[PDB]
Amino acid sequence: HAQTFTAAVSKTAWTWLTSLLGGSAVIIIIGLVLATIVAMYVLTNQKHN
Amino acid sequence: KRQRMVMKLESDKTFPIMLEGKINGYACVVGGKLFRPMHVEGKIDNDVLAALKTKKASKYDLEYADVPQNMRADTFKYTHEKPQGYYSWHHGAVQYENGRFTVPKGVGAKGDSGRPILDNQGRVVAIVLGGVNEGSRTALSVVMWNEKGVTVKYTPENCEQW
């Protein structure tokens, strides 16, 4: 058996790869959410009514 | 009679902004905070205020600065409330309605940005960054303060910078 395309090294390997690649995605999402809510904050501060 | 209104209007003074002997605008102080439009560049007439460190507002196109304590008494008083009617402005009375301030057409141009709007009692209601003529009147891109203690900039469509 020499077939090696995915060849999952370990559960720890995938766990770490998810941790350091995907957590950055979470931080990006948090930043986008903060930007959106502060944009709405500016909108309501200017004229909530 | 408008003569008494003009006399009351012409009482207080502001600090102009100079650029190579040219007055690109005015820099007023209200409530202990120094203000001047960011798009207008120059040197403030008074040296001391010109020495103050200021910070920029990306979406508000003006700078802000804290006046020294020993001079905060000599500042203009503000008003968050804006009753309907006409208000005194340096060039002339401002007739405002529907929350937007209008001036007679042909009044106000470049270099008139930052000049505060005074009420009947002299309290500053809002300051003007620019204006656009749209007919018999000329709407002004003024920035007002809300009752809760916030800052609002009512800018008309495709307004003109001053």
XYZ file of N, CA, C and O in Angstrom:
844
model
N 0.844 -1.189 0.000
C 0.000 0.000 0.000
C 0.879 1.239 0.000
O 1.495 1.565 1.019
N 0.923 1.938 -1.131
C 1.676 3.179 -1.240
C 0.791 4.359 -1.611
O 1.311 5.437 -1.922
N -0.527 4.186 -1.576
C -1.438 5.268 -1.915
C -1.415 6.317 -0.812
O -1.780 6.035 0.334
N -0.983 7.526 -1.156
C -0.832 8.609 -0.185
C -1.269 9.909 -0.856
O -0.478 10.565 -1.543
N -2.537 10.268 -0.670
C -3.041 11.581 -1.053
C -3.532 12.388 0.137
O -3.094 13.526 0.343
N -4.428 11.829 0.940
C -4.797 12.462 2.211
C -3.873 11.913 3.290
O -3.066 12.651 3.861
N -3.962 10.609 3.540
C -3.103 9.907 4.490
C -3.033 10.661 5.819
O -1.991 11.167 6.236
N -4.198 10.743 6.459
C -4.346 11.462 7.716
C -3.277 11.024 8.707
O -3.220 9.853 9.096
N -2.407 11.956 9.093
C -1.279 11.596 9.943
C -1.762 11.190 11.329
O -1.389 10.131 11.845
N -2.614 12.008 11.943
C -3.088 11.719 13.290
C -4.285 12.603 13.594
O -4.513 13.623 12.938
N -5.046 12.195 14.611
C -6.109 13.054 15.113
C -5.532 14.333 15.702
O -6.105 15.415 15.540
N -4.390 14.228 16.383
C -3.735 15.420 16.903
C -3.323 16.347 15.773
O -3.402 17.573 15.906
N -2.859 15.780 14.660
C -2.445 16.613 13.540
C -3.611 17.434 13.015
O -3.494 18.653 12.839
N -4.753 16.789 12.779
C -5.914 17.517 12.291
C -6.423 18.494 13.337
O -6.889 19.586 12.996
N -6.332 18.125 14.615
C -6.773 19.019 15.677
C -5.951 20.299 15.693
O -6.499 21.405 15.719
N -4.625 20.166 15.656
C -3.773 21.347 15.637
C -3.985 22.158 14.369
O -4.035 23.390 14.416
N -4.119 21.482 13.225
C -4.312 22.197 11.970
C -5.610 22.989 11.987
O -5.670 24.114 11.479
N -6.662 22.413 12.566
C -7.891 23.163 12.781
C -7.660 24.323 13.740
O -8.209 25.415 13.553
N -6.849 24.104 14.775
C -6.650 25.130 15.794
C -5.979 26.368 15.213
O -6.495 27.484 15.338
N -4.838 26.190 14.553
C -4.096 27.338 14.047
C -4.531 27.763 12.653
O -4.119 28.833 12.193
N -5.345 26.963 11.974
C -5.966 27.348 10.709
C -7.466 27.152 10.884
O -7.969 26.028 10.789
N -8.176 28.247 11.136
C -9.585 28.195 11.468
C -9.891 29.068 12.664
O -10.923 29.745 12.703
N -8.992 29.065 13.650
C -9.068 30.063 14.700
C -8.814 31.458 14.172
O -9.449 32.422 14.612
N -7.897 31.581 13.208
C -7.720 32.844 12.504
C -9.010 33.259 11.809
O -9.364 34.446 11.790
N -9.737 32.291 11.249
C -11.037 32.594 10.663
C -12.004 33.107 11.720
O -12.791 34.022 11.458
N -11.962 32.527 12.922
C -12.832 32.985 14.002
C -12.509 34.425 14.371
O -13.409 35.245 14.589
N -11.221 34.753 14.451
C -10.822 36.119 14.774
C -11.273 37.077 13.679
O -11.720 38.198 13.956
N -11.175 36.648 12.419
C -11.657 37.465 11.306
C -13.153 37.719 11.440
O -13.635 38.841 11.236
N -13.912 36.675 11.777
C -15.353 36.828 11.943
C -15.661 37.796 13.076
O -16.559 38.638 12.965
N -14.931 37.683 14.185
C -15.153 38.582 15.316
C -14.882 40.022 14.906
O -15.637 40.938 15.252
N -13.794 40.242 14.169
C -13.486 41.587 13.708
C -14.554 42.141 12.787
O -14.927 43.313 12.886
N -15.059 41.306 11.876
C -16.123 41.747 10.980
C -17.383 42.095 11.759
O -18.056 43.089 11.463
N -17.715 41.280 12.761
C -18.886 41.549 13.587
C -18.717 42.860 14.340
O -19.651 43.666 14.435
N -17.526 43.091 14.893
C -17.268 44.341 15.598
C -17.394 45.534 14.660
O -17.983 46.556 15.023
N -16.855 45.417 13.445
C -16.966 46.508 12.483
C -18.423 46.786 12.131
O -18.844 47.946 12.060
N -19.210 45.729 11.919
C -20.620 45.917 11.585
C -21.377 46.585 12.727
O -22.157 47.523 12.505
N -21.156 46.118 13.957
C -21.904 46.670 15.077
C -21.467 48.096 15.366
O -22.289 48.922 15.768
N -20.194 48.434 15.146
C -19.811 49.826 15.361
C -20.320 50.706 14.225
O -20.583 51.893 14.435
N -20.482 50.158 13.018
C -21.126 50.927 11.958
C -22.570 51.246 12.325
O -23.025 52.391 12.183
N -23.299 50.248 12.821
C -24.656 50.498 13.296
C -24.657 51.430 14.498
O -25.599 52.210 14.684
N -23.610 51.363 15.319
C -23.474 52.270 16.449
C -23.332 53.708 15.976
O -23.937 54.618 16.545
N -22.526 53.934 14.939
C -22.408 55.272 14.364
C -23.749 55.717 13.796
O -24.164 56.871 13.956
N -24.445 54.801 13.120
C -25.750 55.134 12.558
C -26.709 55.601 13.649
O -27.365 56.645 13.518
N -26.784 54.851 14.748
C -27.726 55.202 15.802
C -27.268 56.429 16.584
O -28.107 57.207 17.045
N -25.958 56.629 16.735
C -25.476 57.828 17.409
C -25.812 59.072 16.601
O -26.239 60.091 17.156
N -25.633 59.004 15.281
C -26.011 60.118 14.421
C -27.509 60.377 14.499
O -27.947 61.470 14.872
N -28.319 59.372 14.167
C -29.766 59.529 14.290
C -30.370 58.156 14.564
O -30.601 57.380 13.633
N -30.610 57.859 15.844
C -31.351 56.650 16.177
C -32.795 56.751 15.717
O -33.371 55.765 15.246
N -33.392 57.928 15.855
C -34.727 58.191 15.346
C -34.641 58.741 13.928
O -35.569 58.604 13.132
N -37.136 94.107 14.550
C -36.049 94.798 13.870
C -34.797 93.928 13.822
O -34.380 93.366 14.835
N -34.202 93.818 12.632
C -33.023 92.980 12.446
C -31.735 93.652 12.903
O -30.726 92.962 13.089
N -31.744 94.975 13.082
C -30.525 95.682 13.466
C -30.031 95.232 14.836
O -28.828 95.013 15.030
N -30.946 95.078 15.794
C -30.561 94.610 17.121
C -30.056 93.174 17.072
O -29.113 92.812 17.786
N -30.678 92.339 16.236
C -30.202 90.970 16.069
C -28.779 90.949 15.533
O -27.936 90.187 16.018
N -28.492 91.786 14.533
C -27.139 91.857 13.987
C -26.165 92.350 15.048
O -25.040 91.848 15.161
N -26.581 93.345 15.838
C -25.713 93.865 16.891
C -25.371 92.786 17.909
O -24.214 92.659 18.326
N -26.363 91.999 18.324
C -26.095 90.907 19.256
C -25.220 89.838 18.615
O -24.357 89.250 19.278
N -25.431 89.578 17.324
C -24.639 88.580 16.615
C -23.172 88.984 16.541
O -22.281 88.142 16.699
N -22.899 90.267 16.317
C -21.543 90.754 16.106
C -20.809 91.021 17.415
O -19.825 91.769 17.425
N -21.256 90.414 18.512
C -20.660 90.685 19.814
C -19.423 89.825 20.051
O -18.335 90.342 20.319
N -19.577 88.507 19.962
C -18.491 87.581 20.243
C -17.546 87.463 19.050
O -17.869 87.840 17.921
N -16.362 86.919 19.318
C -15.304 86.789 18.329
C -14.860 85.336 18.221
O -15.021 84.543 19.150
N -14.292 84.995 17.073
C -13.712 83.683 16.831
C -12.246 83.843 16.442
O -11.737 84.954 16.287
N -11.569 82.714 16.282
C -10.147 82.695 15.944
C -9.969 82.141 14.540
O -10.204 80.937 14.317
N -9.576 82.956 13.570
C -9.518 82.495 12.182
C -8.335 81.561 11.949
O -7.421 81.441 12.764
N -8.374 80.896 10.798
C -7.322 79.990 10.360
C -6.614 80.643 9.184
O -7.259 81.017 8.198
N -5.297 80.774 9.282
C -4.507 81.439 8.258
C -3.626 80.432 7.535
O -3.091 79.503 8.148
N -3.485 80.620 6.225
C -2.537 79.848 5.424
C -1.869 80.820 4.459
O -2.465 81.205 3.449
N -0.638 81.215 4.781
C 0.144 82.130 3.951
C -0.604 83.436 3.710
O -0.734 83.901 2.576
N -1.125 84.020 4.784
C -1.863 85.256 4.673
C -3.257 85.103 4.119
O -3.917 86.114 3.859
N -3.726 83.875 3.929
C -5.059 83.606 3.415
C -5.867 82.872 4.476
O -5.381 81.909 5.077
N -7.090 83.339 4.710
C -7.960 82.764 5.728
C -8.803 81.652 5.121
O -9.876 81.902 4.564
N -8.324 80.412 5.225
C -9.065 79.285 4.672
C -10.259 78.894 5.533
O -11.133 78.163 5.057
N -10.317 79.353 6.776
C -11.404 78.962 7.653
C -11.255 79.587 9.022
O -10.448 80.496 9.229
N -12.061 79.090 9.958
C -12.085 79.588 11.324
C -11.964 78.424 12.295
O -12.405 77.307 12.013
N -11.351 78.699 13.443
C -11.141 77.707 14.494
C -11.753 78.248 15.783
O -11.184 79.138 16.421
N -12.912 77.718 16.159
C -13.633 78.150 17.346
C -13.449 77.163 18.493
O -13.138 75.988 18.286
N -13.644 77.660 19.712
C -13.601 76.854 20.928
C -14.959 76.948 21.610
O -15.452 78.051 21.874
N -15.560 75.795 21.890
C -16.830 75.717 22.604
C -16.720 74.638 23.670
O -16.375 73.491 23.366
N -17.001 75.005 24.918
C -17.001 74.044 26.001
C -15.651 73.483 26.378
O -15.591 72.397 26.960
N -14.563 74.172 26.057
C -13.240 73.674 26.358
C -12.633 72.790 25.295
O -11.586 72.183 25.545
N -13.248 72.697 24.124
C -12.764 71.853 23.043
C -12.473 72.715 21.822
O -13.327 73.497 21.392
N -11.270 72.573 21.275
C -10.880 73.309 20.083
C -11.301 72.547 18.834
O -11.081 71.339 18.724
N -11.908 73.260 17.888
C -12.450 72.648 16.684
C -11.990 73.404 15.451
O -11.883 74.632 15.467
N -11.714 72.657 14.386
C -11.455 73.246 13.083
C -11.651 72.172 12.032
O -11.318 71.008 12.277
N -12.207 72.517 10.873
C -12.409 71.510 9.827
C -11.090 70.897 9.387
O -10.078 71.585 9.246
N -11.115 69.586 9.158
C -9.904 68.883 8.753
C -9.556 69.167 7.299
O -8.375 69.285 6.953
N -10.564 69.279 6.432
C -10.288 69.577 5.033
C -9.680 70.961 4.867
O -8.917 71.191 3.921
N -10.012 71.893 5.752
C -9.391 73.210 5.738
C -8.075 73.122 6.497
O -8.044 72.699 7.655
N -6.988 73.514 5.843
C -5.668 73.488 6.451
C -5.117 74.900 6.554
O -5.451 75.781 5.757
N -4.276 75.104 7.555
C -3.673 76.399 7.780
C -3.101 76.459 9.181
O -2.917 75.438 9.843
N -2.818 77.682 9.613
C -2.365 77.939 10.970
C -3.399 78.803 11.671
O -3.858 79.805 11.112
N -3.778 78.403 12.884
C -4.725 79.184 13.661
C -4.093 80.521 14.023
O -2.873 80.627 14.203
N -4.927 81.558 14.119
C -4.401 82.898 14.361
C -3.662 82.976 15.690
O -2.572 83.555 15.769
N -4.235 82.401 16.744
C -3.596 82.430 18.054
C -2.488 81.389 18.123
O -2.687 80.230 17.746
N -1.319 81.809 18.605
C -0.178 80.905 18.678
C -0.422 79.769 19.664
O -0.105 78.610 19.369
N -0.991 80.076 20.831
C -1.097 79.071 21.885
C -1.951 77.904 21.423
O -1.558 76.737 21.545
N -3.126 78.198 20.870
C -3.978 77.130 20.370
C -3.304 76.399 19.220
O -3.422 75.175 19.098
N -2.574 77.136 18.379
C -1.845 76.512 17.282
C -0.803 75.529 17.794
O -0.435 74.589 17.081
N -0.316 75.726 19.017
C 0.653 74.808 19.596
C 0.021 73.535 20.138
O 0.752 72.594 20.465
N -1.302 73.481 20.253
C -1.951 72.323 20.848
C -1.909 71.126 19.907
O -2.083 71.261 18.693
N -1.669 69.950 20.478
C -1.783 68.711 19.722
C -3.253 68.401 19.458
O -4.090 68.498 20.360
N -3.568 68.031 18.220
C -4.939 67.747 17.821
C -5.011 66.363 17.192
O -4.004 65.802 16.753
N -6.221 65.815 17.156
C -6.473 64.530 16.525
C -7.542 64.689 15.454
O -8.378 65.594 15.507
N -7.504 63.793 14.476
C -8.326 63.895 13.281
C -9.543 62.982 13.371
O -9.540 61.961 14.061
N -10.594 63.369 12.653
C -11.813 62.577 12.538
C -11.997 62.194 11.079
O -12.221 63.063 10.229
N -11.913 60.895 10.794
C -11.921 60.437 9.408
C -13.253 60.732 8.731
O -13.290 61.241 7.605
N -14.359 60.416 9.400
C -15.679 60.604 8.815
C -16.310 61.940 9.176
O -17.377 62.263 8.646
N -15.692 62.718 10.062
C -16.273 63.982 10.484
C -15.522 65.198 9.962
O -16.031 66.315 10.091
N -14.333 65.008 9.385
C -13.621 66.059 8.659
C -13.361 67.279 9.543
O -13.548 68.426 9.134
N -12.913 67.024 10.768
C -12.528 68.100 11.670
C -11.579 67.542 12.719
O -11.484 66.329 12.921
N -10.881 68.449 13.388
C -9.972 68.106 14.469
C -10.522 68.609 15.796
O -11.328 69.542 15.850
N -10.057 67.985 16.876
C -10.499 68.327 18.219
C -9.287 68.437 19.131
O -8.278 67.756 18.932
N -9.399 69.300 20.137
C -8.297 69.528 21.058
C -8.836 70.104 22.357
O -9.759 70.920 22.341
N -8.245 69.687 23.473
C -8.613 70.211 24.778
C -7.875 71.516 25.029
O -6.646 71.574 24.916
N -8.626 72.558 25.367
C -8.043 73.856 25.682
C -7.371 73.750 27.045
O -7.715 72.857 27.832
N -6.406 74.606 27.361
C -5.815 74.573 28.700
C -6.833 74.958 29.758
O -7.811 75.659 29.487
N -6.601 74.469 30.979
C -7.534 74.745 32.066
C -7.645 76.240 32.332
O -8.751 76.768 32.491
N -6.516 76.948 32.334
C -6.520 78.366 32.666
C -7.259 79.210 31.639
O -7.466 80.404 31.878
N -7.655 78.631 30.509
C -8.403 79.353 29.495
C -9.759 78.736 29.188
O -10.454 79.227 28.290
N -10.161 77.682 29.901
C -11.431 77.032 29.600
C -12.629 77.887 29.984
O -13.728 77.648 29.476
N -12.448 78.869 30.868
C -13.552 79.766 31.189
C -13.985 80.553 29.963
O -15.184 80.727 29.718
N -13.021 81.020 29.170
C -13.300 81.814 27.978
C -13.623 80.862 26.831
O -12.814 80.606 25.937
N -14.840 80.328 26.865
C -15.307 79.427 25.824
C -16.783 79.688 25.588
O -17.478 80.258 26.434
N -17.259 79.265 24.428
C -18.643 79.504 24.064
C -19.519 78.372 24.575
O -19.124 77.203 24.571
N -20.714 78.733 25.028
C -21.632 77.774 25.617
C -22.484 77.133 24.534
O -22.933 77.802 23.603
N -22.702 75.834 24.668
C -23.393 75.033 23.672
C -24.846 74.805 24.060
O -25.267 75.065 25.190
N -25.615 74.311 23.094
C -27.008 73.947 23.313
C -27.331 72.729 22.467
O -27.250 72.784 21.237
N -27.702 71.635 23.124
C -28.106 70.443 22.394
C -29.496 70.598 21.795
O -29.794 69.992 20.761
N -30.345 71.405 22.420
C -31.706 71.608 21.954
C -31.739 72.657 20.851
O -31.059 73.684 20.931
N -32.533 72.387 19.817
C -32.653 73.260 18.650
C -34.124 73.516 18.351
O -34.737 72.815 17.535
N -34.728 74.504 19.005
C -36.110 74.863 18.675
C -36.221 75.400 17.257
O -35.294 76.016 16.727
N -37.376 75.152 16.643
C -37.612 75.616 15.281
C -37.642 77.137 15.229
O -38.140 77.796 16.146
N -37.103 77.693 14.154
C -37.083 79.127 13.969
C -35.832 79.551 13.225
O -35.249 78.779 12.471
N -35.443 80.800 13.460
C -34.263 81.393 12.854
C -33.178 81.599 13.903
O -33.462 81.865 15.072
N -31.930 81.464 13.472
C -30.778 81.615 14.346
C -29.802 82.625 13.766
O -29.760 82.847 12.552
N -29.007 83.224 14.646
C -28.027 84.221 14.247
C -26.742 83.539 13.802
O -26.237 82.644 14.485
N -26.224 83.964 12.655
C -24.955 83.494 12.128
C -24.158 84.706 11.672
O -24.725 85.764 11.390
N -22.835 84.540 11.594
C -21.950 85.687 11.404
C -22.360 86.516 10.192
O -22.458 87.745 10.272
N -22.616 85.860 9.062
C -23.019 86.599 7.872
C -24.433 87.145 8.013
O -24.723 88.260 7.564
N -25.323 86.383 8.634
C -26.689 86.836 8.809
C -27.497 85.773 9.512
O -27.002 84.687 9.827
N -28.763 86.101 9.753
C -29.659 85.165 10.413
C -29.885 83.934 9.542
O -29.960 84.018 8.314
N -29.993 82.780 10.192
C -30.185 81.505 9.511
C -31.599 81.023 9.786
O -31.965 80.776 10.941
N -32.382 80.862 8.724
C -33.729 80.320 8.823
C -33.664 78.820 8.574
O -33.277 78.384 7.485
N -34.041 78.037 9.579
C -33.927 76.588 9.511
C -35.281 75.949 9.763
O -36.084 76.453 10.552
N -35.516 74.827 9.093
C -36.757 74.088 9.238
C -36.494 72.645 8.842
O -35.543 72.357 8.113
N -37.330 71.743 9.357
C -37.217 70.314 9.078
C -35.856 69.769 9.508
O -35.362 68.785 8.952
N -35.237 70.409 10.496
C -33.959 69.967 11.006
C -32.756 70.378 10.191
O -31.626 70.066 10.587
N -32.948 71.064 9.070
C -31.848 71.502 8.223
C -31.820 73.022 8.176
O -32.873 73.670 8.157
N -30.618 73.585 8.184
C -30.430 75.026 8.244
C -30.251 75.587 6.841
O -29.477 75.050 6.043
N -30.984 76.655 6.537
C -30.946 77.281 5.225
C -30.551 78.744 5.359
O -30.861 79.406 6.354
N -29.854 79.235 4.341
C -29.447 80.636 4.266
C -29.879 81.173 2.910
O -30.091 80.401 1.962
N -30.044 82.488 2.790
C -30.347 83.060 1.475
C -29.265 82.704 0.471
O -28.079 82.648 0.804
N -29.687 82.447 -0.763
C -28.740 82.062 -1.798
C -27.749 83.188 -2.050
O -28.098 84.370 -2.000
N -26.502 82.811 -2.318
C -25.436 83.774 -2.472
C -24.773 84.214 -1.186
O -23.946 85.133 -1.220
N -25.104 83.597 -0.055
C -24.491 83.910 1.229
C -23.665 82.712 1.668
O -24.174 81.586 1.722
N -22.394 82.950 1.980
C -21.519 81.878 2.408
C -20.769 81.230 1.262
O -21.365 80.884 0.239
N -19.461 81.071 1.417
C -18.627 80.465 0.388
C -17.419 79.836 1.075
O -17.442 79.580 2.283
N -16.365 79.585 0.304
C -15.144 79.020 0.860
C -14.528 79.967 1.879
O -14.555 81.191 1.725
N -13.958 79.384 2.931
C -13.417 80.145 4.033
C -14.412 80.481 5.119
O -14.011 81.000 6.168
N -15.692 80.197 4.908
C -16.716 80.403 5.918
C -17.015 79.137 6.698
O -17.938 79.127 7.516
N -16.265 78.069 6.452
C -16.457 76.836 7.192
C -15.989 77.005 8.632
O -15.034 77.731 8.919
N -16.680 76.326 9.541
C -16.341 76.365 10.944
C -16.921 77.521 11.726
O -16.732 77.572 12.947
N -17.621 78.442 11.079
C -18.189 79.567 11.811
C -19.424 79.107 12.578
O -20.359 78.577 11.973
N -19.458 79.280 13.894
C -20.545 78.708 14.691
C -21.869 79.415 14.454
O -21.931 80.555 13.991
N -22.946 78.706 14.779
C -24.301 79.239 14.706
C -24.769 79.524 16.125
O -24.749 78.633 16.982
N -25.195 80.757 16.372
C -25.621 81.179 17.697
C -27.139 81.261 17.778
O -27.812 81.589 16.796
N -27.670 80.955 18.957
C -29.095 81.078 19.230
C -29.411 82.515 19.637
O -28.579 83.418 19.523
N -30.629 82.737 20.134
C -30.990 84.055 20.640
C -30.171 84.427 21.869
O -29.844 85.604 22.064
N -29.827 83.447 22.700
C -29.088 83.691 23.931
C -27.579 83.590 23.751
O -26.846 83.691 24.739
N -27.098 83.377 22.529
C -25.679 83.316 22.270
C -25.073 81.935 22.359
O -23.909 81.761 21.976
N -25.817 80.949 22.849
C -25.301 79.590 22.911
C -25.164 79.009 21.509
O -26.054 79.168 20.669
N -24.041 78.344 21.253
C -23.770 77.797 19.929
C -24.576 76.523 19.734
O -24.530 75.610 20.565
N -25.315 76.459 18.633
C -26.137 75.295 18.334
C -25.384 74.292 17.473
O -25.375 73.092 17.758
N -24.750 74.770 16.405
C -24.015 73.911 15.490
C -23.014 74.760 14.722
O -23.091 75.992 14.718
N -22.058 74.085 14.088
C -21.056 74.740 13.257
C -21.180 74.206 11.837
O -21.622 73.075 11.614
N -20.780 75.030 10.874
C -20.959 74.736 9.457
C -19.628 74.309 8.857
O -18.606 74.978 9.052
N -19.639 73.192 8.134
C -18.486 72.753 7.362
C -18.587 73.113 5.888
O -17.557 73.230 5.217
N -19.796 73.294 5.375
C -19.975 73.661 3.983
C -21.444 73.860 3.690
O -22.301 73.730 4.568
N -21.724 74.181 2.431
C -23.095 74.399 2.012
C -23.232 74.300 0.511
O -22.270 74.495 -0.236
N -24.451 73.989 0.076
C -24.775 73.861 -1.338
C -26.045 74.649 -1.619
O -27.031 74.535 -0.882
N -26.013 75.459 -2.673
C -27.199 76.171 -3.120
C -28.081 75.230 -3.926
O -27.610 74.570 -4.857
N -29.366 75.168 -3.568
C -30.318 74.285 -4.232
C -31.554 75.045 -4.699
O -32.625 74.457 -4.868
N -31.423 76.348 -4.926
C -32.554 77.166 -5.314
C -32.543 78.514 -4.626
O -31.501 79.170 -4.558
N -33.696 78.938 -4.106
C -33.765 80.226 -3.427
C -32.972 80.223 -2.126
O -32.448 81.266 -1.720
N -32.874 79.079 -1.462
C -32.094 78.941 -0.244
C -30.832 78.137 -0.536
O -30.620 77.646 -1.648
N -29.988 78.004 0.484
C -28.736 77.263 0.372
C -28.575 76.425 1.631
O -28.301 76.961 2.707
N -28.763 75.116 1.498
C -28.583 74.226 2.633
C -27.114 74.160 3.023
O -26.220 74.247 2.179
N -26.872 74.003 4.319
C -25.525 74.011 4.866
C -25.194 72.650 5.457
O -26.024 72.035 6.135
N -23.974 72.180 5.198
C -23.490 70.928 5.774
C -22.986 71.221 7.182
O -21.787 71.355 7.444
N -23.930 71.336 8.100
C -23.634 71.659 9.479
C -23.519 70.371 10.279
O -24.082 69.331 9.927
N -22.771 70.440 11.374
C -22.660 69.345 12.330
C -23.265 69.822 13.643
O -22.828 70.833 14.207
N -24.281 69.106 14.118
C -25.008 69.456 15.328
C -24.706 68.458 16.437
O -24.083 67.417 16.220
N -25.151 68.797 17.642
C -25.005 67.935 18.803
C -26.377 67.496 19.278
O -27.300 68.311 19.356
N -26.502 66.218 19.598
C -27.778 65.670 20.016
C -28.007 65.921 21.503
O -27.096 66.276 22.253
N -29.257 65.727 21.922
C -29.639 66.009 23.300
C -28.918 65.090 24.277
O -28.560 65.505 25.385
N -28.692 63.840 23.883
C -28.066 62.860 24.758
C -26.584 63.124 24.986
O -25.976 62.439 25.814
N -25.996 64.086 24.291
C -24.573 64.315 24.350
C -23.782 63.665 23.240
O -22.646 63.239 23.480
N -24.344 63.572 22.036
C -23.681 62.936 20.905
C -23.451 63.989 19.826
O -23.828 65.154 19.994
N -22.828 63.596 18.716
C -22.490 64.517 17.640
C -23.127 64.042 16.342
O -22.994 62.871 15.978
N -23.815 64.950 15.650
C -24.550 64.637 14.430
C -24.144 65.625 13.346
O -24.085 66.832 13.597
N -23.880 65.118 12.144
C -23.487 65.942 11.000
C -24.496 65.748 9.866
O -24.405 64.800 9.085
N -25.461 66.662 9.780
C -26.441 66.669 8.695
C -25.797 67.297 7.469
O -25.634 68.516 7.392
N -25.424 66.466 6.500
C -24.827 66.955 5.267
C -25.787 66.749 4.107
O -26.216 65.613 3.858
N -26.142 67.803 3.381
C -27.029 67.644 2.226
C -26.343 66.897 1.094
O -25.118 66.756 1.055
N -27.163 66.415 0.162
C -26.646 65.651 -0.964
C -25.713 66.506 -1.808
O -25.992 67.679 -2.072
N -24.606 65.897 -2.236
C -23.570 66.538 -3.050
C -23.302 67.968 -2.591
O -23.319 68.919 -3.372
N -23.056 68.112 -1.294
C -22.761 69.423 -0.741
C -21.376 69.893 -1.176
O -20.552 69.122 -1.675
N -21.126 71.182 -0.971
C -19.899 71.828 -1.407
C -19.036 72.160 -0.197
O -19.520 72.751 0.774
N -17.765 71.776 -0.260
C -16.841 72.038 0.835
C -16.467 73.513 0.890
O -16.261 74.157 -0.141
N -16.368 74.042 2.102
C -15.935 75.418 2.294
C -14.688 75.470 3.160
O -14.045 76.512 3.286
